[PDB]
Design a protein around this ligand. Structure first.
Ligand SMILES: CCCCCCCCCCO[C@@H]1O[C@H](CO)[C@@H](O[C@H]2O[C@@H](CO)[C@@H](O)[C@H](O)[C@@H]2O)[C@H](O)[C@H]1O
Ligand SMILES: CCCCCCCCCCO[C@@H]1O[C@H](CO)[C@@H](O[C@H]2O[C@H](CO)[C@@H](O)[C@H](O)[C@H]2O)[C@H](O)[C@H]1O
Ligand SMILES: CCCCCCCCCCO[C@@H]1O[C@H](CO)[C@@H](O[C@H]2O[C@H](CO)[C@@H](O)[C@H](O)[C@H]2O)[C@H](O)[C@H]1O
Ligand SMILES: [F-]
Ligand SMILES: [F-]
Ligand code: NA
Lengths: 126, 96, 124, 96
């Protein structure tokens, strides 16, 4: 109940810190679809896909690690609100094409990262 | 680490009472451009309008013939970790 | 550095609220887990308002910007839980609610961002 | 604290060498159901096959007439925090 909390926070902080570091150094390189926010969403996409597969195969994995990796790392590493203002701005700057693209590349890109990581581990294990 | 300030501010066409200016947009998501213009020779005072970030040109009109004007431009842009903010201005002089 | 604290502090506060809200409420509607939706809508609202407000207040210390946006909002919102729910729905062959959850989340978040923004700008 | 196990598992239609079973979905995102069966007494061996999460009926088609079978159904479901996991089974016996 508090050991759980501590899990959300270590995972979360490592996730948020990592996003921050990748966003501030790489987002400015490509305004129309800033690569920092894309990559972290994809990365978490990938990672939680592999956890779909791993958790399934390891039902007795400690809840503390499950919570830390998912709600923790992947929750705090990924981000909807930033994706959401980037798109909002592209819409206000009348750049609809890239508002639309950004929305697709994040959604599909992420589903695919999740498909990838999951199908890679349900083949590497069985 | 990227400049949000427009570059190459220039008058492109001119009539005795109007100016067409163009600039190069900064590599940054610009929502709109603020354009200011007033008479270089002291108090006139300075007038302001905005232009959609799409555009990189603007028409200033309703000016006096044979007068020195100061024209400046800065951007209302989006960036990560500042969200919506304003840039430094770029600036030129043109005598009608 | 100190602005790293702001990320950690705001982020862990955002991450925490997510945790509580999602566990308590996601199981109420499996086709569209209402916990991770509320956090996404709320984060988009908060960020929409901050967008408008920070504009009209250049000069409000990068630190407390850093904590609210890429801290609170970043730890509050999630893309990975959103993608994992849709994937599970796709895999269950539940395509309608998979498409629906994509629409509701994206459009809902954008509407929340626009609401937060225009409310503050249509205020002053 | 929602249950991920199906309910009301039962034989709705029976031939002497096959059965039609149905259950009520557990009210979680069921990605697929798993059906097991095998002769109750001693040996068998047990067999398992899957049905899509959007199906709550299935047919078991190679049975020995006159014999008791044990049939279980469990889910693979998605849930928050646990992601993908297998549920507990619900079970019935049914002769023939
Ligand atoms: C469209 C957007 C794409 C975005 C990118 C992500 C793509 C995700 C792929 C979906 O995963 C597959 O979905 C199938 C369909 O749900 C499942 O088949 C299952 O579906 C059943 C029901 O149709 C049966 O037909 C099959 O044999 C099988 O059991 C299959 O197991 C699963 O791996
Ligand atoms: C689903 C999503 C829900 C939320 C959508 C919100 C985005 C729209 O925001 C508006 O976008 C307009 C268009 O981008 C802007 O107008 C500006 O857009 C310029 C585009 O070049 C000009 O054409 C306009 O006249 C000018 O006022 C306008 O100020 C802005 O408030
Ligand atoms: C009644 C109609 C109200 C419409 O409200 C919108 O609010 C925007 C926010 O105040 C306006 O400013 C926007 O209008 C465009 C002027 O070029 C944009 O490019 C600028 O960002 C500017 O702030 C925009 O005109 C206006 O339609
Ligand atoms: F959001
Ligand atoms: F993601
Ligand atoms: Na997040």
């Amino acid at each position: 109940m508090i050991k759980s909390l501590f899990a959300v926070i270590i995972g979360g902080s490592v996730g948020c810190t990592l996003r921050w570091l990748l966003s501030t150094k790489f987002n400015s390189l490509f305004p129309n679809l800033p690569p920092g926010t894309l990559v972290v969403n994809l990365l978490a996409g990938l990672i939680i896909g592999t956890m779909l597969a791993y958790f399934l195969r390891q039902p007795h994995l400690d809840p503390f690690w499950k919570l830390m990796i998912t709600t923790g790392l992947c929750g705090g590493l990924s981000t909807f609100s930033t994706f959401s203002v980037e798109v909002f701005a592209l819409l206000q700057a009348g750049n609809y094409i890239w508002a639309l693209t950004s929305v697709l590349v994040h959604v599909i890109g992420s589903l695919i990262m999740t498909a990838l990581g999951f199908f890679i581990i349900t083949i590497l294990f069985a | 680490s990227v400049s949000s300030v427009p570059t190459k501010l220039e008058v492109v066409a001119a009539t005795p009472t109007s100016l067409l200016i163009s600039w190069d947009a900064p590599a940054v998501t610009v929502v709109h451009y603020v354009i200011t213009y007033g008479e270089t020779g002291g108090n006139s005072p300075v007038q302001e309008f905005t232009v959609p970030g799409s555009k990189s040109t603007a028409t200033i009109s309703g000016l006096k013939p044979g007068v020195d004007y100061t024209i400046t431009v800065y951007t209302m842009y989006y960036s990560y970790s500042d969200l919506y903010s304003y840039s430094s201005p770029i600036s030129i002089n043109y005598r009608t």
